[PDB]
Design a protein around this ligand. Structure first.
Ligand SMILES: Nc1ncnc2c1ncn2[C@@H]1O[C@H](COP(=O)(O)OP(=O)(O)OP(=O)(O)O)[C@@H](O)[C@H]1O
Ligand SMILES: Nc1ncnc2c1ncn2[C@@H]1O[C@H](COP(=O)(O)OP(=O)(O)O)[C@@H](O)[C@H]1O
Ligand SMILES: Nc1ncnc2c1ncn2[C@@H]1O[C@H](COP(=O)(O)OP(=O)(O)O)[C@@H](O)[C@H]1O
Ligand SMILES: [Mg+2]
Ligand SMILES: [Mg+2]
Lengths: 173, 510, 460, 458, 85
């Protein structure tokens, strides 16, 4: 796992994308590269002991939909260091960095069944007061909750599920 | 998974245009700073051993040219530096200022003057790192280098071009013997250099004013890297002193260089090597600690006149130059079976071992026979001194061991009552006072009237006054040859007769 | 305005990240709000990408990641001058004493370079301490270093207090006492014994004890030294006491291990011989003043070859050994004159008369050391008529070394004496060359100049 | 063709096209400033990178320099042409004379002779040294090794062996100075040239001023000339002045090549690096090499991995010691540690064997008594133990000998002692026929008939 | 290019090995021609288990008074010979 190696590259890509007003294009460029990193044949090439320069060129070729600034430079710098397998994480960090500057939070909600869209809009407006961000809810229908909802806002979590209260009671005894 | 000194904004600069080599290869930026070691990014033009110039007026030495960064050490206070400082590469391999105008100055390890007397009148610059003359360029050392000490000029002779280790425990007269050997060259055409490594500044100032008192300072260069200073300065100081002496060596002149402590250059190099994460060996010293001293001491050499001609482009035709080294080593608790002491014993030619027991007993200088040797031997001596003092060090090698074994009584008194009174009076007359150097004539007459009897029966133990009267009688009246036996070094029967005559003539008045 | 963020916390080591251009320098001080209390961090390394690795001058517990860190643009700074006399402070120059606040006019950084070469005093001088044993057998160079090697109970504290007193009353200097890595009990009872002796008004105390995080025990010695330097600049002669320099070495070893550097000859840090010299090189005489230093030394496993003793002995000018045998004899100060040593007993440094007087005293005492063993097995009457005389003179020399101290009156009642060097030279010449043979050995005990010995013999 | 990408001290990394990467001992060339520097490749990393050791000073090297791929290993001149001359590690002439006139050049990396090709000989070789050929006799075509710390006598002895065998010997000779003083190489060269024997001795020097690569490969380039003279059917003498410096120069380089350190710092490959050299210096059925190697032991520790792993490769091991040298008893051989493959009754005769073993036995018995003599003094010994003590001290003195090469450290004339005379003398001492002389009668003498004379003059 | 044989180091074995000098791969090195081996055997193998053993009660004679009398060796025993050089 290489969160720690991806942090510098994600920060550099993002801090460059705001100097050139193209965060939105960079995100999809990195998403394309992150997908090419997963192919079964390309993953065989990335493991072999090719020279960084020719291995970078063998990676540029499969992605022509890239800027001069973005692919032909970032991919080469990551190849010199042998970091290309880190691309799937350089993407996520990038997304995260963006959500920080844009003052956004990807709050996740979990429930036994769909919410009434009055409950859900109240949740949105209430979390935006709990936090200091524009929230973007996405729901999940997990049956083991049975009733109530779990609200996860990163590392913070609020558990209102009947199963959580049941198994808390089981330890009150 | 670890980072390798690639960071967000440098990656951003590469993002702007991959071929940043379109920028100058002449400069870079500091990237990290730790315990005097520095990491630099850029400097595509840097070459190993190069001086890199930092903001302010400071230099670093490029030790590592790695895949993307240069590792260097800072020659001075490093805490003032910070990330991102622009740094420029001077295209010069480390070079110190050198010349005969340095005589009488006290200078930093970089040839920056440390006395208050202004800039240097140096001749040029010369590389701190060099390879000594080859095997075909040397010449056999057969000229005497005179120290003031009756003990070493007799038992442990030194010769221009030789390398004498002075090894002993702390506070046993090592620096005394070294600066007295320097003082004795005051009027013998042979230049001096004293490089102090890791010494505390009070001592260095005291020895500097002591050299000035006796008039020797006008003849010597002093290079100083005190105990407070960065490890890189302490580790590179003796190479600067060697580069300063090698100038006189290569001009067909004579120089004598004294490294005041190689056992602390070794410690500074160990610090530098362990901060660079290199695997250590025995006693935690690096693997190449031997190659630290050898390529230094191997530069003290005597070169034939063809090499001086080829070097000076013909200008000095037919003179032979030499550089004589006397490194000092401090050994813990008197044992020489240790890594660095044995490493240096394996490089220098001779070995003057000063013993703490003798030193406490009042025998000074405490030159221990049997352990001390001169691998050049009698070839270095004036033939008078060579003949008078034939084999006495090996005589004392057994006198000591036998006086140690036969402790209960003087049994088997065949001649042991003569042997171990001769060997006692010889020790008692080798005793000497510092700053009192005895010319070869005074040493030669004294040795003759000890070594073939004439004083093996008279255990008078009033020897200091007897000799102080002898050397005064022979100076005032009895001998003008004191300026002839000290001009030639000759050993005739015709002069032996005159020596016997003056001997008995003085004897008959004590 | 705070600008950094804490990024790691591992034990006492804290990493903080700054903007790429605002990176602190190497020995700068940062600070953090660790709950309510502020905490000071001393930078130790600059890593790549704006990260800086520092060591906490305090308890590391309770620190989150991401806390705001404020960059002070200067190293640790402490108060200096007269205001600090009689107080107690910690490394950060804060009163751990409870007498309120220090009204200092000025503050100095604890890190600086030693005196330059052209700045040292072009002279060599002795320090008249006023104690017979030290002045005779182990003189003090003004600006030198001195080792104290005794154990406990031998009266070490009373020796330090007598020195603190004499350097202030007879000379006109002050004193700094830096207690690094020692028991808190001993510092408390030392402060109380000094206030019960009216010397507290003349000494400034700094403490980092065993219960302190590594960085405090490391930098306390530099705090004491930088106060002694402010006293020096004023033109005075200063005494600096280091209660255990071995603990300064050992705390440097601990900090080095925390930073993750490779272990040196015996596990010590690789920077041992430089960390020691950076301290000991500031203790020098200058042509404005001088700092003399008295340092209690501890030898691991009684090994004088271990790298720490081996590095310390390179800097000491004198060495005073305290022995319990001399104290059991009721002789105070309990200085062992045979092992006590100084490299100023050089006949050209101190003179021929002093040198030969000390050598004669030593020879007499080390002859008595063997005559005592002969007596112990054969009885007194086996000694020849000559040995019986050297014993009689040895037992008198051995007692003329004792002295009454101005601070020891609470034990002996005697008014306490300050003896000039030439007067003790005279007295020991006398006793040694047979003069004063005609009075009993008890006439020399616990007395000042030899004229007082003859007058006590009169009264006796 | 390739470019430098790193420079760490003595080691250099070079990048080549992956279709042209050099092999693992080829030589490469770089224009270092104005000089020409040779690199020997030690490793093939991935990506076309290659790690090399610089056969020269590494300073001045930029990264990005172009390097030229010589497609052959280091090769040295060999044969008759190389006799009266001094050569570099690269086989270049280092005396000021012209080029070498060789017709043939050999690669310095070669395989050891096969097992069916070896030959073994019992033919004893005589030296004018009492202790060596009493306690540790060695044979024509065998290996000798002199072990000692620093200052104990290894070189003064090797020079005495050179004088006593290498001059009154027909065939050629080779001297490799691996990491020793240049002063001694110049002295040896001028002694040979002033004795008109230089026409038979071929010299190679990698002295201690040189960077690690020269000290690393100089021993191999000398062994190659010895091997060429062997294959011509001749019999050769090979003197290696310090083989320890061959392993040491590896250790200095080992860490930079990226190899995890082993026992006391040495490289992991210490025993293989040593065996690959020691095993090709051997006699064969076509020719023989008689070799003398000095073997430095660091810190006088005979159990350090390098001496310990070197002991196995020698036939006769002469162990010098500092304790004996401090007594002035040169040559400072320790007879309770020197041994030889040839010290068997079926090879050296029963009388020689019995004399040597009796000497060992009573010196060991004296060793066993030293510790009680130290505490209680010599008066507690039994009446027959005082006799073994006295005879042991007289043997220790009689083992000393003056040397023709030590004739300038002392003034004593050098002595040559025949094997018959030395066993005749030691057999005489052991059985007490010389009990009446003092110890000093035996110090620094030749045969025993000189000790009986020295006794008269005290 | 490298191909993986599925085999494991095997070595010649048999009575024809008796009296030969052989390298660790089974090749003759004495020069007396090829081996009269009796097939091949795996270099790395599993020792006989507990129930397949039998007690050591037969002597293997060294011919040394010091060993055979006071440090006997039996057929099936493992005796270390340890010492200095
Ligand atoms: N021949 C001598 N006679 C009397 N005293 C001597 C003699 N030589 C030296 N000394 C004295 O010994 C003292 C110590 O000598 P010195 O300082 O030269 O030793 P050192 O080797 O420099 O010790 P270190 O460098 O470890 O301090 C000096 O003060 C000097 O006065
Ligand atoms: N100068 C002196 N005069 C009289 N008694 C003394 C003197 N110095 C020390 N003592 C005695 O020695 C004792 C030693 O105790 P203390 O000073 O606490 O030892 P330490 O200080 O080493 O722990 C003192 O309490 C006192 O009784
Ligand atoms: N027979 C001998 N007579 C006198 N000195 C000897 C003799 N053998 C050895 N030595 C001493 O050995 C010293 C060290 O030189 P050397 O033997 O070459 O050392 P190393 O063993 O380190 O090469 C010489 O200076 C010399 O005094
Ligand atoms: Mg000194
Ligand atoms: Mg040698």
């Amino acid at each position: 796992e290489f969160i720690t190696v991806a942090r510098p590259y994600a920060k550099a890509a993002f801090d460059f994308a705001v100097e050139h007003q193209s965060v939105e294009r960079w995100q999809d460029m990195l998403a394309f590269a992150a997908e090419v990193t997963k192919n079964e044949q390309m993953a065989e090439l990335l493991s072999g002991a090719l020279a960084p320069e020719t291995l970078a060129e063998s990676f540029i070729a499969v992605a022509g939909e890239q800027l001069d600034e973005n692919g032909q430079n970032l991919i080469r710098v990551m190849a010199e260091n042998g970091r290309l397998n880190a691309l799937p994480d350089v993407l996520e960090q990038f997304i995260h960095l963006r959500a920080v500057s844009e003052a956004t939070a990807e709050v996740d909600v979990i429930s036994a069944a769909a919410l009434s869209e009055q409950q859900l809009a109240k949740i949105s407006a209430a979390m935006e007061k709990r936090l200091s961000r524009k929230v973007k809810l996405n729901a999940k229908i997990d049956k083991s909750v049975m009733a109530g909802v779990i609200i996860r806002a990163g590392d913070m979590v609020i558990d209102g599920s009947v199963r959580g209260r049941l198994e808390r009671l089981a330890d009150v005894l | 998974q670890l980072n390798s000194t690639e960071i967000s904004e440098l990656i951003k600069q590469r993002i702007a245009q991959f071929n940043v080599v379109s920028e100058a290869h002449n400069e870079g930026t500091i990237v990290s700073v730790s315990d005097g070691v520095i990491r630099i990014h850029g400097l595509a033009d840097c070459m190993q051993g190069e001086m890199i110039s930092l903001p302010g007026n400071r230099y670093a030495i490029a030790l590592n040219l790695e895949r993307d960064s240069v590792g260097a050490v800072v020659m001075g206070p490093y805490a003032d530096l910070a990330e991102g400082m622009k740094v420029k590469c001077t295209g010069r391999i480390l070079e110190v200022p050198v010349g005969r105008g340095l005589l009488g100055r006290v200078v930093n390890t970089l040839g920056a003057p440390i006395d208050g007397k202004g800039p240097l009148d140096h001749d040029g610059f010369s590389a701190v790192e060099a390879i000594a003359p080859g095997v075909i360029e040397r010449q056999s050392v057969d000229q005497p280098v005179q120290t003031g000490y009756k003990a070493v000029d007799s038992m442990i002779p030194i010769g221009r071009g030789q390398r004498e280790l002075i090894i002993g425990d702390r506070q046993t007269g090592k620096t005394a013997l070294a600066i007295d050997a320097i003082i004795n060259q005051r009027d013998s055409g042979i230049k001096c250099i004293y490089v102090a490594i890791g010494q505390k500044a009070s001592t260095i100032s005291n020895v500097v004013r002591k050299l000035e008192e006796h008039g020797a300072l006008a003849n010597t260069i002093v290079v100083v890297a005190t105990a407070s200073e960065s490890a890189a300065l302490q580790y590179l100081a003796p190479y600067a002193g060697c580069a300063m002496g090698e100038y006189f060596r290569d001009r067909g002149e004579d120089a004598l260089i004294i490294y005041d402590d190689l056992s602390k250059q070794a410690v500074a190099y160990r610090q530098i090597s362990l901060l660079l994460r290199r695997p250590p060996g025995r006693e935690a010293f690096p693997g190449d600690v031997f190659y630290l001293h050898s390529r230094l001491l191997e530069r003290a050499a005597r070169v034939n006149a063809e090499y001086v001609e080829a070097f000076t482009k013909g200008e000095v035709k037919g003179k032979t130059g030499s550089l004589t080294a006397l490194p000092i080593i401090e050994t813990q608790a008197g044992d020489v079976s240790a890594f660095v002491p044995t490493n240096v014993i394996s490089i220098t030619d001779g070995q003057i071992f000063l013993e703490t027991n003798l030193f406490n007993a009042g025998i000074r200088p405490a030159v221990n026979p049997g352990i001390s040797v001169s691998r050049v031997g009698g070839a270095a001596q004036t033939k008078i001194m060579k003949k008078l003092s034939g084999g006495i060090r090996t005589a004392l090698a057994q006198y000591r061991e036998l006086a140690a074994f036969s402790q209960f009584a003087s049994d088997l008194d065949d001649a042991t009552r003569k042997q171990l009174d001769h060997g006692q009076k010889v020790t008692e007359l080798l005793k000497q006072k510092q700053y009192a150097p005895m010319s070869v004539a005074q040493q030669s007459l004294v040795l003759f009237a000890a070594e073939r009897g004439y004083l093996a029966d008279v255990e008078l133990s009033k020897i200091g006054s007897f000799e102080a009267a002898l050397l005064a009688y022979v100076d005032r009246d009895h001998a003008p040859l004191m300026q002839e036996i000290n001009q030639t070094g000759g050993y005739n029967d015709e002069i032996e007769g005159k020596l016997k005559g003056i001997l008995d003539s003085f004897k008959a008045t004590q | 305005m705070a600008t950094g963020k804490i990024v790691q916390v591992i034990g006492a080591v804290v990493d903080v990240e700054f903007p790429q251009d605002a990176v602190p320098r190497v020995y700068d001080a940062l600070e953090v709000q660790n709950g309510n209390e502020r905490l000071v961090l001393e930078v130790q390394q600059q890593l790549g990408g704006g990260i800086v690795r520092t060591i906490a001058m305090g308890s590391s517990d309770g620190l989150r990641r991401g806390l705001d860190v404020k960059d002070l643009e200067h190293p640790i700074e402490v108060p200096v001058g007269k205001a600090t006399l009689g107080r107690i402070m910690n490394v950060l120059g804060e009163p751990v004493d409870m007498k309120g606040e220090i009204g200092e006019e000025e503050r100095w950084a604890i890190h600086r370079a030693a005196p330059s070469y052209e700045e040292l005093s072009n002279s060599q001088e002795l320090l008249e301490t006023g104690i017979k044993v030290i002045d005779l057998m182990a003189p003090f160079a003004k600006g030198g270093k001195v080792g104290l090697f005794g154990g406990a109970g031998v009266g070490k504290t009373v020796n330090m207090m007598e020195l603190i007193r004499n350097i202030a009353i007879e000379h006109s200097g002050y004193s700094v006492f830096a207690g690094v890595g020692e028991r808190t009990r001993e510092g408390n009872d030392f402060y109380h014994e000094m206030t019960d002796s009216n010397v507290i008004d003349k000494v400034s105390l700094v403490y980092g004890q065993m219960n302190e995080p590594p960085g405090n025990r490391l930098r306390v010695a530099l705090t004491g030294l930088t106060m002694a330097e402010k006293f020096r600049d004023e033109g005075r002669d200063v005494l600096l006491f280091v209660d255990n320099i071995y603990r300064y070495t050992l705390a440097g070893t601990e900090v080095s291990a925390l930073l993750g550097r490779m272990p040196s000859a015996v596990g010590y840090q690789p920077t041992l011989a430089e960390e020691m010299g950076v301290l000991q090189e500031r203790i020098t005489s200058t042509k404005t003043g001088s700092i003399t230093s008295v340092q209690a030394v501890y030898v691991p496993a009684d090994d004088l070859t271990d790298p720490s003793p081996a590095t310390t002995f390179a800097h000491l000018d004198a060495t005073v050994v305290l022995s319990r045998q001399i104290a059991s004899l009721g002789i105070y100060p309990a200085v062992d004159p045979l092992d006590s040593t100084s490299r100023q007993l050089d006949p050209l440094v101190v003179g021929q008369e002093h040198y030969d007087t000390a050598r004669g005293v030593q020879s007499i005492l080390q002859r008595y050391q063997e005559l005592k063993d002969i007596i112990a097995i054969l009885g007194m009457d086996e000694l020849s008529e000559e040995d019986k005389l050297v014993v009689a003179r040895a037992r008198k020399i051995q007692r003329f070394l004792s002295q009454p101290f101005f601070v020891a009156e609470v034990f002996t009642g005697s008014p306490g004496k300050y003896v000039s060097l030439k007067d003790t030279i005279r007295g020991f010449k006398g006793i040694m060359e047979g003069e004063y043979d005609h009075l009993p050995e008890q006439a020399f005990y616990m007395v000042g100049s030899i004229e007082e010995a003859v007058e006590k013999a009169k009264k006796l």
